[PDB]
Design brief:
The structure is a homohexamer.
Chain A: H1 10-13, E1 18-20, H2 25-32, E2 36-44, E3 47-54, E4 57-62, H3 67-80, E5 85-93, E6 104-113, E7 127-128, H4 131-143, E8 148-156, H5 162-166, E9 171-173, H6 176-184, E10 189-198, H7 201-216
Parallel strand pairs in A: 1-4, 1-5, 5-10, 6-8, 8-9
Antiparallel strand pairs in A: 2-3, 3-4, 6-7, 6-10
Helix pairs in contact in A: 3-6, 4-7
Chain lengths: 218, 250, 250, 218, 218, 250
């Protein structure tokens, strides 16, 4: 293998430059199933990867595991293999009264309440998403008629609240702060989308949206 | 007036809900003239305000002055007067060799190297721009054929040490900022300015929309000096862009 | 199950109060096999659990996955299920030239270069191991004739910049970690890993006992590459050691 | 111009080595009016400057604008032009029961609750005034029979309280922390005086005091 | 003298490689009295030192004074003279209901609420005791039948509580954080033991325990 | 006694409200002898106290010992006994090449590189000296014809790494202090000492007056070694100065 954890080689990617990075293997398979020529590449610890194609171009789908630490490994090694655009999809609850279950959330930037993001940039640096990716997710969501909210997500290491709600924070999760910061401070494009499950259909649509967004970014 | 600094009444705004906020009062009239029925509302200190019309809707153009403290006063009072969308327009220097004079920068979020933003949200909170505003600014730039760069900006409470300038009286830069510019450059930061951290953070945490566009008038990383119109043409384009963006946000 | 992630019921543990917690689920069965009546309890994501018997007492072997967040979930749920003693076992790289491949490291406390630990105790609080556990691990190591090093470990939220690795995509390390490895080396830190800060801090602040042992399978400060059994023999010894230690802690 | 913002040249200062730095242009004119040969030099954005003379020596009066950020620009560029002593005068409220409207406050050091001071020295460094300047302000105040209080001022970026009062803090403003720190850490002398307007006569006397203090420091 | 404060020379130590470091001179004398050939070496400010022998090997006993600052001086200069193992003994109160007056506390690591420890290592570094020393203290305590508790001690600069109690902290004092951190980050072995006097017999036994622990570490 | 450490009763002070606080108890009697009717009050650990008379008023001379923790105890107990004005006197080394042995330093404020001060006021609060005390000390120095330097002092919780000394056992200085001395020098800091941050901060935040004077007995930035009377004459002058200053503060 060309990398320490993923068990992948550059050749395995077949020129892929974009990767979709959900948290678990189950979701990886479901995402890969929506694309062309899905092929399972490897599975080591929390990192299960597949290769697939969109409009004739190779795309990678790889699970990140739980939290910023494991996420940072997957993103770095995928970068080493040639990936330059990362799209994460997840399912989360919402903390705003106007956000309904089934809605889709596109994250513009995250509140950095994690530890790993600090390993890439000091706290003053924004955990901001790439404009092209954010645009692609919003466009994809709109193309399937999804009710979408675009804004800030609070990201922490644990599985201050009322304050985040009062500040307009949409939801909570644990990986976006690390993902967005490590990409925005290293010349990598990153996007984040999530289906609201509380405040598998919402997940299926969020999954479809991330795939259609990927298509726009190839 | 119903505000302690701008010297404006809510009636003066004619129900305007969008404001273009340049830093220099000298640029206010110029921007207002681009629109319909421009009228000078007030002028107190560095807070010069004009009102205009764009496609039937009243719009405000008000200067912020230099720095986050000055900017917070302008933004908070305008918000008290009903403004819900803020578009900052300015001219800036770039810190990336590939960014050229005449190019346009649209900021997605800023590095918070200031103090005022901390009064509106903890450091962990991102100084992020509103999506609709950023989209509007990117589309307006493209419609004009401008070479655009979309990304991160470093917002500093100082023009000198915070931007790691050494051609100063002391020639010294405190530890925190020694080698900081090279770091920001390596992280893909486009430029330095001094008001966005406050503007973006206070708007994003208070349900207000804000965006920022700037024309590059100099690049300290290139040895070629900016053409005689070191500002003019570029400033004009930047103004054109923010007005066109506002037109899509009313 | 009575826990949201491990998919285990308290009854599944058979009253076990000690758990051996490796990071990789692939190593769980191997460890469980060293003991009596090993049985696979569950396997959800990177949380693979087996139950076994040691001198008449039920013991649990459950993987933690990578990182403090993942580890906190495993530890908290196991604690909810009755586990009061945690022994982490792993393989690691060393950062001291005098530490050789095949040697064994027993950690007294860790440098908290993570985020999860902060949710259980402020930074001022030490990520310290329980004395009984550390003693048990040191004695088990000695009983096997292993070359043992007892001291501080650096626990990082990242495998790359936090361990000051430059052979990366960007080749860049943020200021905070530039020159950090040489500093840790000068302070006598033995190695880097990614879960101990969370494990030790949450146990020490919640009345639970925890210890950690690891077999050295590589040393980035030595040019000689690890023998073909870069892991095997050493892993085997490390597993032998933690099981023997557990035997003294029941 | 020899500087980026002020629109001034070294020649414009005619050897001036001391500058009085109030916040607004109106106050600049009033201060310059108390000295000999007052001449308006320039006005760019928040920086309006005048030149005048005291005992035959040139002195500069220049507005700083609002907050530490703009203040830091004015002070640096004036330093580049040769100014080595800075005296700020302002009008503020007081937070101590024994301080009466009309009294004069001379700041020995400031609580650093601003952002700009950190761009010159780490937080452990004191935002302390120069001894000669503080002495000159106290002497000037006493010479006109002003009731004076000497002590600490809290300085922040916004336009913790009861705590400052309990700690003996005299008043609140937004520029002294930056001014004092940037000068005390760069070999420049700085002083701060203020008239109490709540808790234009108090201002007129504070203005006279800063001019008479300047005279003692030439 | 070979050092700035202690007034000692390398020769004075006669090969000593271990030092017992209590806080006051009275305790120094009492400790030295338990060993062979006790000799008072010097007394300068808070640093009073004696030399003695255990199993034919020279050992130093030296007072540290109050707090991390003075402690850091004593430990550094003793290190310069050849000491490589330091054992501190003190008397403290306890904050846990199950800890009784007369019990002995052996510190595994300390909560770093002091200022001096930061002069040796960043806050993330643990103020952890050396394993051999901790083991020697526990063994010595057990050998005289003392009721012993092993765990964390909170160390501050002043002469958050309920929180420390809830986190299992055993007691409070002011020197261990500095001692343990400066030793663990500089290749020096350090141990900490204390007799509980509230929550001279407990002191006499704690004193005996530190001497017997020293014997095991020569 | 009515205090837990000094072993003094309020009656012992004879109503004194000013105290001269040197660090070394050995220097207490020397200072007390300069005044009228000197008498040894007590001596407990490094807290040696004497009482004297100056122009009819009772004055106290009490040692503080080394470091902020020790100093806070002395100051707080003396304050409990009625002392409202504290004058610290000491001998120090300088870090500025232009400051010579024999010169006198009067401190306006200190860099808080300690921990004890933080218990009395947050870091943002300045470790500033009282104006009356500083004026009194500057005037007393001038009256004696001493070459005086008035400015900032760096107060450290350590004599070694905090003062960036490398001639130590480890020869190592933690990141925070690497290159710190050159920084302090560039900022015009006059010297290093270890008690002022605590003394000045606790007095300034509690309505008490405090000042500090010190005689330079060495300069690590000059290669010339201090004359055989490396302390004597200078110490004598420093003592003379603080007594004369106290005379103006009663």
């Amino acid at each position: 293998s060309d990398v320490f954890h993923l068990g992948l080689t550059k050749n395995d990617l077949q020129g892929a430059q974009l990767a979709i990075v959900p948290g678990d293997p189950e979701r990886v398979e479901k995402i890969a199933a929506l694309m062309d020529k899905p092929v399972k590449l490897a599975s080591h610890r929390e990192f299960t990867s597949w290769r697939a194609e969109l409009d004739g171009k190779a795309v990678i789908v790889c699970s990140t595991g739980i939290g910023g630490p494991s996420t940072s490994i997957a993103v770095e090694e995928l970068a080493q293999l040639g990936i330059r655009t990362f799209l994460r999809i997840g399912t989360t609850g919402a903390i705003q009264p106007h956000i309904n279950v089934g809605d889709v959330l596109v994250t513009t930037a995250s509140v950095r309440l994690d530890g790993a993001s600090l390993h890439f940039a000091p706290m003053e640096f924004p955990a901001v998403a790439d404009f092209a990716c954010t645009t692609a997710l919003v466009e994809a969501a709109k193309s399937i008629g999804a009710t979408t909210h675009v804004g800030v997500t609070a990201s922490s290491d644990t599985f201050s609240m009322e304050e985040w709600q009062a500040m307009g924070v949409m939801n909570y999760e644990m990986e976006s702060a690390t993902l967005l910061t490590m990409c925005a401070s290293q010349g990598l494009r990153a996007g984040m989308v999530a289906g609201v499950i509380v405040n598998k259909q919402t997940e299926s649509h969020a999954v479809k949206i991330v795939v259609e967004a990927a298509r726009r970014l190839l």
